[PDB]
Amino acid sequence: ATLCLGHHAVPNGTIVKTITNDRIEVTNATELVQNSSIGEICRLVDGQTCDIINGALGSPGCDHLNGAEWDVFIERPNAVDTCYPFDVPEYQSLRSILANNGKFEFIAEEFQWNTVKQNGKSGACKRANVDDFFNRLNWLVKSDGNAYPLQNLTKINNGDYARLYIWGVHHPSTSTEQTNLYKNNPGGVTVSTKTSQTSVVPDIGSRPLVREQSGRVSFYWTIVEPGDLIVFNTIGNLIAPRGHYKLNNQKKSTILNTAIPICKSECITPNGSIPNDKPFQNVNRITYGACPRYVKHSTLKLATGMRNVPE
Partner 1 sequence: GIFGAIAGFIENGWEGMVDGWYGFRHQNSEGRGQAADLKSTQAAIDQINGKLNRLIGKTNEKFHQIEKEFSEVEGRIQDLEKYVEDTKIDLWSYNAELLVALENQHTIDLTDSEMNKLFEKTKKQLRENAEDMGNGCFKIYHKCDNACIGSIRNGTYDHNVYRDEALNNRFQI
Partner 2 sequence: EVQLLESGGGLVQPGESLRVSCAASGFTFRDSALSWVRQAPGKGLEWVSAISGNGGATYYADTVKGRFTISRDNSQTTLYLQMNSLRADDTATYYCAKDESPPIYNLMPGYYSTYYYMDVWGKGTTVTVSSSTKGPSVFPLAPSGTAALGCLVKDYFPEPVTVSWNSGALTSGVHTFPAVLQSSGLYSLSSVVTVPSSSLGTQTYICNVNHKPSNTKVDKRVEPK
The one of partner 1, partner 2, none whose footprint includes residue 3, by CB under 5 to 8 A per kind, is: partner 1
Q: In terms of CB distance, is 27 or 237 closer to partner 2?
A: 27
Picking from 72, 179, 182, the residue whose alpha carbon sits closest to that of residue 117 is 182
The one of partner 2, partner 1, none whose footprint includes residue 208, by CB under 5 to 8 A per kind, is: none
Phi, psi of 178, deg, nearest 5: -60, -55
The one of partner 2, partner 1, none whose footprint includes residue 297, by CB under 5 to 8 A per kind, is: partner 1
In whole angstroms, the minimum distance from the beta carbon of 11 to partner 2 comes to 17
Rounded Cα distance between 245 and 86, Å, is: 20
Cβ(52)–Cβ(95) under 8 Å? yes
The one of partner 2, partner 1, none whose footprint includes residue 43, by CB under 5 to 8 A per kind, is: none
Q: In terms of CB distance, is 34 or 237 closer to partner 1?
A: 34
In whole angstroms, the minimum distance from the beta carbon of 237 to partner 1 comes to 31
Rounded Cα distance between 286 and 119, Å, is: 44
Beta bridge partners of 218: 87, 169
Rounded Cα distance between 42 and 45, Å, is: 11
Q: Does 266 bind partner 2 (CB under 8 A)?
A: no
Rounded Cα distance between 31 and 311, Å, is: 27
Structural element, H or E, at residue 33: strand 33-34
Q: Does 304 bind partner 2 (CB under 8 A)?
A: yes
**What is the pattern of x (binds partner 2, CB under 8 A) and - over residues 221-260?**
----------------------------------------
Q: Does 30 bind partner 2 (CB under 8 A)?
A: yes
Neighbours of 277 (CB within 10 A): 10
Neighbours of 110 (CB within 10 A): 7
> What is the DSSP-derived secondary structure letter of residue 63?
G
Rounded Cα distance between 97 and 155, Å, is: 21
In whole angstroms, the minimum distance from the beta carbon of 60 to partner 1 comes to 29
In whole angstroms, the minimum distance from the beta carbon of 280 to partner 2 comes to 15
Q: Does 277 bind partner 2 (CB under 8 A)?
A: yes
Q: In terms of CB distance, is 26 or 88 closer to partner 1?
A: 26
> What is the DSSP-derived secondary structure letter of residue 215?
-
**HEC profile for 110-150?**
CCCCCCCECCCCEEEEEECCEEECCCCEEECECCCCCCCCC
Q: Does 114 bind partner 2 (CB under 8 A)?
A: no
In whole angstroms, the minimum distance from the beta carbon of 277 to partner 2 comes to 7
Q: In terms of CB distance, is 36 or 175 closer to partner 2?
A: 36
Rounded Cα distance between 69 and 53, Å, is: 15
Q: Does 306 bind partner 2 (CB under 8 A)?
A: no
Q: Does 10 bind partner 2 (CB under 8 A)?
A: no
Binding site for partner 1 (CB under 8 A): 1-11, 16-20, 24, 26-27, 30, 32-33, 100, 251-252, 254, 266-267, 276-280, 285-297, 300-311
In whole angstroms, the minimum distance from the beta carbon of 107 to partner 2 comes to 47
> What is the DSSP-derived secondary structure letter of residue 193?
-
Q: Does 305 bind partner 2 (CB under 8 A)?
A: yes
- Residues in contact with partner 2 by the rule CB under 8 A: 28, 30, 277, 304-305
